[PDB]
Structures are given as structure tokens and as C-alpha cells.
């Protein structure tokens, strides 16, 4: 079997994507962000605290003929922006882009923090990192991928971000007209439940490269570019006027700069993100500065190719027993 589904930004900015996902029976169509840096779909539902829904569709369990109460299980889960949420599990049926997995854990939130509520276009998340990262309790439960696996006609999903634009995510295929010249495949860790890799190094606009081991993960439920303070302090002296900022909490820049492209290295292959892409508009309505795309990762404690980079590329999750990551220009 197959999927492929429409994934598309969620503002003007791409701070997220959301991709269509049909649960239970008759189907309740909700809104995702599928996140490959965490392993629970969880969703907005009817057992939602009211006073933190807004603007959200809701799952409703009691409306599926094909959803059961996963007795005793609960989860929490909290992400590296410091937002989280937590309640209890049901399994039901789940497609996506024509993909159906039978009892999936659907992971209905009792309780979710202020950026949630805040955002009305986001209905939930659809973890596509290791199942050893799945937050349910007592029983661990398995990703929407993990299930799909074995009957997928290749253990894989590509992520085909757009900039200010719609793309796809496909599961069980290469779609070899979406992307030019070849895939360059690179090892990945498991060892802390992400697509963990090592970039071979980076380029600051027509500069020369520099050859340097970059361990990160790819990770497309993060926004922006979090990358070593040194590599992010190259960055950003070459655009003038460009500062950190303690009190907007990054890089700014003045508005009316044009950004130099970020290369980052997959083996002995180059993926260019153009200037544009790191470019995250105003700090505030009106104001003339703006917000970078490449951020320092320093006190997060990892890198993390988020969209701004991995929205410049075609990106393979190869799941077979060993695991690695393709990525092809575009």
C-alpha cells in the first residue's frame, strides 16, 4: 500500500504545516501537524478542557463506531518550545492520503497549554520520530508509520515541504519526478528516538565551504534552522545590521536586507537554502525588524534541521532495519 496527502502552511511565514488525517468511522477529518521529531498523534477532542478549545475540530470518540477506550492509558508529552499536553488513549481507525492503519492509538487531549489553544489551525500532531519516544503509559503505543510499515510497498515517507506553498508527504514510495538530479543517503542514530544525522558541513552565500561534522536531527514539527553558535554567528555577520537580540530571544535583522543563501552538506552532496527562506518577517506588526530563520541551538542542547532547511530539499525517512535519511535537491 500507499499514501499521499497535501501538506500546507498554516500562515504566511510556514511557521507550520498541516496535513489532512481521516479518524474513525464515519471519518472525522482533522487538521495535523505531522512532527518527526515526536511519536504521538494526539488531537483535540470532546474531552477537551472548553476554556482551551478555540477554533479547533474536535475528535469525538462517542461518534465512531470503530473507536475503543485504550483502558488505563494516559499521556503527557511536553516539546522543546515548552508547550504540552496531555489525557487519555483510544484506538480507531486511521488514514492519510488514502493510508488506512486499524487500531492506532489516538491520543485525545484532555489538557493542552496556551500555544495550542492560541492556535486555532492545528488540531493536533501526528508523531513520525522512533515509537520508543511515544509518551503513553503504562503500554507504549506505536506511530501512525510504525503500524503502516509492513504493509507500506517500501518501509519509507518523504516530506516535501513547500516555501509559502503547498507540498505532500507520501508513505510506501519515492515519487521520482519531485525532485531533480539524485538522493544522497546519510546514516542515522536512534539512540534518542529522532532522525538523528550528521551533516558533512556548510556554506554562508557564494562562500567557501566549510567542512565540519554537524550531528542534528531532521525535524519537520520545528519551524527554523537551530544550528551551533558559531556556524549561526557566520551566518548572520554577513548581513548588515544583523544582531542577538536577549530581549526578542534571536537573530534580528533589518527588514530591508536581502539574506544571503545557507548550504548545508549531506555527504559530498549540498542542499542551498535561498535567502528568502530564512527571512521570518516583522518581530511585531509594523516593525522594521525582522526575524531569522537560523537560530543558535546553543541551551537546547541539539541541532535541529527544522522546515527553513528541510523545506529546500526532498527528504527521505527510510524505516528499514536500518535505518537512514535521502535528501535531493528540489
Known amino acids: 500500500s500507499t499514501g499521499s496527502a497535501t ?12 496535513t489532512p488525517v481521516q479518524i474513525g468511522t464515519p471519518a472525522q477529518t482533522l487538521n495535523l501537524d505531522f512532527d518527526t521529531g ?31 477506550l485504550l483502558s488505563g492509558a494516559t ?31 489516538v491520543e485525545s487531549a484532555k489538557k493542552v497549554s496556551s500555544s495550542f489553544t492560541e492556535d486555532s489551525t492545528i488540531d493536533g500532531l501526528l508523531g513520525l520520530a522512533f515509537s520508543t519516544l511515544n509518551t503513553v503509559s503504562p503500554t507504549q503505543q506505536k506511530t501512525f508509520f510504525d503500524n503502516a510499515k509492513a504493509s507500506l510497498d517500501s518501509p519509507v515517507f518523504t516530506a516535501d515541504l513547500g516555501y509559502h506553498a503547498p507540498g505532500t508527504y507520501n508513505f510506501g514510495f519515492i515519487d521520482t519526478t519531485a525532485y531533480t538530479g539524485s538522493i544522497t543517503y546519510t546514516a542515522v542514530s536512534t539512540k534518542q528516538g529522532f532522525w538523528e544525522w550528521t551533516s558533512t558541513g556548510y556554506a554562508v552565500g557564494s562562500g567557501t565551504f ?20 558559531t556556524v549561526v554567528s557566520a551566518y548572520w555577520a554577513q548581513v548588515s545590521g544583523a544582531k542577538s537580540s536577549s530581549s526578542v530571544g534571536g537573530y534580528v535583522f533589518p527588514c530591508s536586507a536581502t539574506l544571503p543563501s545557507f548550504t548545508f552538506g549531506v555527504g559530498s552532496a549540498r542542499i542551498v537554502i535561498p535567502g528568502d527562506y530564512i527571512d521570518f518577517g516583522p518581530i ?24 527553513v532547511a528541510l523545506k529546500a530539499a526532498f527528504v527521505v525517512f527510510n524505516g528499514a532495519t536500518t535505518p537512514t535519511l535521502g535528501f535531493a535537491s528540489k
Open 7 to 18: 501538506t500546507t502552511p498554516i500562515d504566511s511565514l510556514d511557521d507550520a504545516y498541516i
Open 38 to 68: 515526536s511519536s504521538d498523534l494526539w488531537v483535540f477532542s470532546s474531552e477537551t478542557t472548553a476554556s482551551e478549545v478555540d477554533g479547533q475540530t474536535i475528535y469525538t470518540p462517542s461518534k465512531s463506531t470503530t473507536a475503543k
Open 75 to 105: 499521556w503527557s508529552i511536553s516539546y522543546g518550545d515548552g508547550s504540552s499536553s496531555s489525557g487519555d488513549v483510544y484506538t480507531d481507525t486511521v488514514s492519510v492520503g488514502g493510508l488506512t492503519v486499524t487500531g492506532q492509538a
Open 210 to 229: 566549510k567542512s565540519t561534522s554537524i550531528d542534528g536531527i531532521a525535524d519537520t514539527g520545528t519551524t527554523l534552522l537551530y544550528l551551533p553558535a
Open 284 to 307: 511585531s506588526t509594523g516593525s522594521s525588524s525582522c526575524f531569522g530563520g537560523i537560530q543558535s541551538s546553543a541551551g537546547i542542547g541539539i541541532n535541529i534541521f527544522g522546515d
